[PDB]
Design a protein around this ligand. Structure first.
Ligand SMILES: *[C@@H]1O[C@H](CO)[C@@H](O)[C@H](O)[C@H]1NC(C)=O
Ligand SMILES: *[C@@H]1O[C@H](CO)[C@@H](O)[C@H](O)[C@H]1NC(C)=O
Ligand SMILES: *[C@@H]1O[C@H](CO)[C@@H](O)[C@H](O)[C@H]1NC(C)=O
Ligand SMILES: *[C@@H]1O[C@H](CO)[C@@H](O)[C@H](O)[C@H]1NC(C)=O
Ligand SMILES: [Ca+2]
Ligand SMILES: [Ca+2]
Ligand SMILES: [Ca+2]
Ligand SMILES: [Ca+2]
Ligand SMILES: [Ca+2]
Ligand SMILES: [Ca+2]
Ligand SMILES: [Ca+2]
Ligand SMILES: [Ca+2]
Ligand SMILES: [Ca+2]
Ligand SMILES: [Ca+2]
Ligand SMILES: [Ca+2]
Ligand SMILES: [Ca+2]
Ligand SMILES: [Ca+2]
Ligand SMILES: [Ca+2]
Ligand SMILES: [Ca+2]
Ligand SMILES: [Ca+2]
Lengths: 276, 71, 276, 276, 276
């Protein structure tokens, strides 16, 4: 394919449509439901996963294609999230105090990323293009940045005294840092508690759909202030009980996955491609 | 500071790219006795230091006979 | 540009040969050396990594392109190995007692694997075809299997009574289980200290080479008894000193890289096939 | 001959085959059978040489053609081995702990070598070509190598402190060292006991065939990790008694010689051609 | 390139002489001087080797190309002398009492001898043609020969009693034995103290010249009584002071080398004839 990637593909606008592929797609795919711990707590049942599997089977999924990956909360789930199935549906519980963390998680898992190691103890780092960011995740990530100048001297900070650096993130499980492009920054991070990578946003993921349970539209998966694109893969529902949420997900799984596309699952389950 | 009659020292006035390798050694302290007028004679015995290589530079040995440009 | 489709590529049998790209490949690519801890212990030199980097620079690798990754032993390294460099060379010491462990390690790193989750509690699992295996990794993997019949009842085993299960792995750091295809199996796995995945062998991993330091050819990266292929990426060297081993690796790095190719799954052409 | 060495030789593809020259080759050649001392010990007979000569005569070798040379073990025989007659068959007993020593002896005696003196106390030495190696042999070789930089000082090793050198051999009766090409190395060798020479591999040696008695395929006569050739002159057999081994050698002497070629013998029995 | 085949050469006249190659050969070749210890004793200078090297450099030999090898006396030098330089000149002192020994030494180093092993304990031996001799060398050789008849019975000797054998050498460090051809001889040799070999004289050795210091023309390098050839490689000089001898050698190095040629056998053309 690689030797024909840069080759045209011609199609005739009269070609007959193929039959529905939803049945065959479900019979050959895997579905992963990511839900918070409080969901299972409120449900308070040990066989609920089996019942959800049976209900999905009523919807056309063979027994063995639906998987359920519990996570404690948004912050913990944001530390190297792993996407295992062909289709990933992440149920994020909305909290008014964690809008930025929800946006960061959605940006991480709704977009492809190409990341490289950052030895912040030895070299200064820039952000070349609007697609370049610094994604740092771990148990507790605190990032301090001192922008330098053409002479390699800190601006508004001392290159040798970290106490003068600028705070952009304090005790973050995950944080995406955007700084002024073309400016060299000296970084100090709690490398013993988190890892920071220079990442590039390649495009959408197309196999991860984030359903926001409650709240309003607050997600912002683009660092550009003048854009808040509400894509088809970021859904929102209102709730009083988790069983209704799960029944809605099961009954409308056809619509949920019609908004997603296969062929995007990476060989590795990581949320970002990594190069060293 | 070491100087030699080889060609490497004949007109050493300006030197660049100076580098060296040196294996460590041990200098052990001997016994020195004090000639007290009366009684027992104290002696200072022992004392060892291991010399390890450090940076090399350029120096000058100024003796009563020869002024040498040394390493 | 056309990523989700396979387009045939036509080439003339007399066009030309482009100049050697080895120098550019070394300049723009990273090298990783994976060696056991006992190698570093025997070398007993603090700056040996710097000397190896200098020698690689003499061979044309820019400084900082080559990385040296330590692993305690074959069993420990087999726990979810992560080979992130452009070119990976793994020095694997031969132990006559760990033939199958080395075979499993090489099969895991010398091949490309597409793995889906396994939830042994809910679902019974088959192996669809010859390329389907069950790869389990962890601090201690113990896998017992109960084959069922068309009526879901165990054969030589009781589903309720796990004591009657047939043990196929015991305290393994990594194991690739192969059972009869087309037969449903109830699995008992120590999920606390071991994760099992349903994996498909897509094909060779081009950018990973294994140099066996020691005994004869024992590796078998194929579950089929009738075939035990020895690919060009499975090198073998007799040794008495680790400095000799590393000097041989550096002096013939051109040939080692020649036996390897860029990971077909790690370049833009693989986009929307599985990964990048 | 010599002036016409660089002249074409033209042959028709219809020239009738000449008769078998095997009989004439045996009638005018001399055969050497190198065996370990333990072989003679286990045979426990003082006339076995006469019996073997008579059996070879039954196989066509005139009385006086075959010769038998005894060596204590691989380590001792590796000290400047001498190949005396037209056809040399070396019976090498296999030991799993001496794989590299067997490989080194096989490399030395199965290939032509062009060696030169190495005054390690005066000059630092390089290995220009992949064919260039450093062959050292004697009572006990301990070679310590210190790579040097443009200033001729040491890299990761003090040029004076031999304790900081890198150890490639220890108490070796024979060792073939292969350092990274193009780097000057200071060599510390136990010159009082053993001698080291800068050697160039010219090509294969047709008059020497090594029969490995027991074991597996472990010989690696090429320093290149990517290649482990098994030439026609490297035989392997399984044994329980030495009389069976010698009967096998006598019975299939025609096949053994067929794997060997004439004209490869030199006036001197040395294992290399020495230039000073 | 075509090795092992005797291709004719069809040169012509009027091809014009090439320029002198003497300077290039001196630049690219090495010279070995073999002298007795009494020479150094009489010279009584610790730097005479350096002065001779400087004088040879005045004659065109690059510094370090001339090697000065020393031997105790003729008998010690007749213990398998090794002449490895491109050009070898042996300053051999004349002694009326060692005439034959002198000749033998010359015959060993002024001629090419293809030697194969001799196992007197196991086989009987005969000399096939006039070029076949028995060369024995070591600490002390004592060869006793018992000629046999067609009934494999000793002639004037008993095959079982070695006291009746006929002595041809006694305490010799080198002896060349010529017996009647076509007759099988039983041999009693001090194999513990010295080694015997069956040697065929292929032809002259051109890189070795012998300068007889003082005396008369006594050398006989051919076993034929009717021939005593004084080849151009056998010089004779009358002497009183060794310094004059060495000055004569260095001054007429041009003539001495002109009397010699590159060893026809030791060069690339002889590949697959006997060496290189
Ligand atoms: C597609 O659907 C049509 C309509 O039911 C059916 O006749 C046909 O067999 C199906 N398959 C194909 C390949 O057209
Ligand atoms: C390739 O190598 C040739 C031979 O040196 C050279 O002329 C040419 O410029 C090189 N580059 C290309 C792109 O052909
Ligand atoms: C070769 O063999 C043939 C057939 O046996 C025989 O006639 C002939 O004399 C032999 N020798 C030569 C030189 O052809
Ligand atoms: C040979 O010698 C002549 C005269 O000494 C000189 O002119 C010429 O350049 C030399 N070389 C050749 C190849 O003729
Ligand atoms: Ca955050
Ligand atoms: Ca500040
Ligand atoms: Ca930016
Ligand atoms: Ca925005
Ligand atoms: Ca059972
Ligand atoms: Ca295992
Ligand atoms: Ca199977
Ligand atoms: Ca197999
Ligand atoms: Ca060895
Ligand atoms: Ca060192
Ligand atoms: Ca080399
Ligand atoms: Ca090899
Ligand atoms: Ca003699
Ligand atoms: Ca007698
Ligand atoms: Ca004779
Ligand atoms: Ca004569």
């Amino acid at each position: 394919q690689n030797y024909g990637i840069n080759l045209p593909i011609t199609g005739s606008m009269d070609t007959a449509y193929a039959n529905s592929t939803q049945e065959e797609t479900f019979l050959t795919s895997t579905l992963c439901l990511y839900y918070p711990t409080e969901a299972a707590t409120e449900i308070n049942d040990n066989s609920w996963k089996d019942t959800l599997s049976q209900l999905f089977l009523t919807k056309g999924w063979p027994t063995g294609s639906v998987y359920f990956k519990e996570y404690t909360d948004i912050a913990s789930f944001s530390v190297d999230p792993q996407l295992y199935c062909d289709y990933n549906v992440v149920l994020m519980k909305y909290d008014a105090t964690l809008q930025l963390d929800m946006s960061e998680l959605a940006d991480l898992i709704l977009n492809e990323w190409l990341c490289n190691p950052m030895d912040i103890t030895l070299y200064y780092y820039q952000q070349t293009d609007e697609a370049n960011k610094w994604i740092s995740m771990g148990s507790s990530c605190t990032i301090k940045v001192c922008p330098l100048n053409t002479q390699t001297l800190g601006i508004g900070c001392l290159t040798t005294d970290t106490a003068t650096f600028e705070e952009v993130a304090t005790a973050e499980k995950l944080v995406i840092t955007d700084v002024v492009d073309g400016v060299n920054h000296k970084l100090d991070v709690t490398t013993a508690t988190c890892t920071i990578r220079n990442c590039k946003k390649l495009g959408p993921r197309e196999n991860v759909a984030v359903i926001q349970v409650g709240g309003s539209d607050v997600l912002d998966i683009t660092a550009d202030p003048t854009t808040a694109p509400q894509t088809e893969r970021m859904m929102r529902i209102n709730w009083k009980k988790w069983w209704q949420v799960f029944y809605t997900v099961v009954d409308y799984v056809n619509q949920i996955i019609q908004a997603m596309s296969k062929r995007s699952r990476s060989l590795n389950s990581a949320a970002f491609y990594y190069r060293i | 500071d070491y100087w030699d009659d080889s060609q490497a020292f004949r007109n050493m006035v300006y030197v660049r790219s100076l580098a060296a390798n040196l294996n460590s050694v041990i200098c052990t302290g001997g016994d020195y006795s004090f000639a007290l007028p009366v009684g027992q004679w104290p002696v200072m015995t022992g004392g060892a230091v291991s010399l390890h290589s450090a940076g090399v530079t350029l120096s000058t040995q100024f003796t009563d006979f020869v002024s040498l440009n040394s390493l």
